[PDB]
Amino acid sequence: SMTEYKLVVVGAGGVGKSALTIQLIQNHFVDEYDPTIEDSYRKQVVIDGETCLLDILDTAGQEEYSAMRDQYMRTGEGFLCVFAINNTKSFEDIHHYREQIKRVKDSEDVPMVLVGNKSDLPSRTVDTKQAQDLARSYGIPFIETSAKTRQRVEDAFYTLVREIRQYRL
Ligand SMILES: N[C@H]1CC[C@@H](N2CCCCC[n+]3c(sc4c(Cl)ccc(O)c43)NS(=O)(=O)c3ccc(O)c(c3)C2=O)CC1
Ligand SMILES: Nc1nc2c(ncn2[C@@H]2O[C@H](COP(=O)(O)OP(=O)(O)O)[C@@H](O)[C@H]2O)c(=O)[nH]1
Ligand SMILES: [Mg+2]
What we know:
Layout: E1 3-10, H1 17-26, E2 39-47, E3 50-58, H2 67-75, E4 78-84, H3 88-105, E5 112-117, H4 128-138, E6 142-144, H5 153-168
Bound molecules: the ligand N[C@H]1CC[C@@H](N2CCCCC[n+]3c(sc4c(Cl)ccc(O)c43)NS(=O)(=O)c3ccc(O)c(c3)C2=O)CC1, guanosine-5'-diphosphate (GDP) and magnesium ion (MG).
């Protein structure tokens, strides 16, 4: 029987949560995917020789209090906190997603990876060192990815699974 990893992809609308998830599932870049769709995406994978199932929740903006967001935060075992390297505001929002997860879990240590998406884009606004420094302060990995060219997409999810395994082992 296969271990199922419940992963949640969080971050400001338009950073590429859906593109990243679809890239992992379908090996395809979507130019557009309806920004209001919050749904689960499953994939059977082998990570470091572990045959397992990834149950990935790709999330939507919710401006006010959301009982269902709280419940996914309670349920999720690992979180990809995604910003876009060309969007400073999405980077600044990261701290708010991390705080919310921690408050819901009532825990300062929760499996998480920081993801800087759209690494293919030549015009960056968020310095790598700045993002790396933040990750260091949180004690989590930092990966730069491109849903468009597939750069580090597997790496980002697989790293998160590694973070979940190590929390336990
Ligand atoms: N797009 C439509 C159909 C799905 C629906 N939806 C989101 C999918 C819920 C998937 C079950 N689930 C969860 S949590 C969760 C996690 Cl942490 C990881 C992987 C999961 O599959 C998962 N189900 S749940 O009851 O907490 C939940 C939370 C938020 C939601 O938007 C929904 C369900 C939901 O209604 C939203 C409307
Ligand atoms: N250039 C580039 N664009 C991307 C990347 N990921 C997403 N996008 C685009 O950014 C926009 C928002 O992506 P989407 O996946 O819907 O983000 P979500 O709201 O966070 O789900 C869409 O136009 C995507 O095509 C990437 O790695 N590189
Ligand atoms: Mg989306």
